[PDB]
Design a protein around this ligand. Sequence first.
Ligand SMILES: O=C(O)CCCc1nc(-c2ccc(Cl)cc2)no1
Length: 134
Amino acid sequence: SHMCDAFVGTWKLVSSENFDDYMKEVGVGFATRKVAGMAKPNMIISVNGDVITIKSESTFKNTEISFILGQEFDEVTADDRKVKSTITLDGGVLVHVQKWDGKSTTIKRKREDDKLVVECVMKGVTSTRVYERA
Ligand SMILES: O=C(O)CCCc1nc(-c2ccc(Cl)cc2)no1
């Protein structure tokens, strides 16, 4: 057993708050916000050795990242930002920092009860997205 066992699995979005405002703050344009905000993604998390894979699949976009904790990687986000990302474990929370164009956003993923809670922060704007096991 290991590092991220309680994250691994298939998860489905069941609530969202403030995501349109988070997307605005990150710079997402109107049409992408409207379509992306309608999506109900499934989040699939797996681990193989030291490599963690997080997939997001929805009607809007399918994305996938694979990474080693603490080791920077390049990521193209669902809104087509070219970012440099680092994901660490901090006290049982996966902390994902994305840097681009002198900007930064942080996405935290945590297990709370039977849920996986995602908090996305850009400057003073936070969005909370709650996932349940599929
Ligand atoms: O998994 C979640 O639900 C949220 C965490 C992953 C994440 N997705 C986005 C995002 C940004 C822009 C656009 Cl268009 C669509 C998606 N930002 O953070």
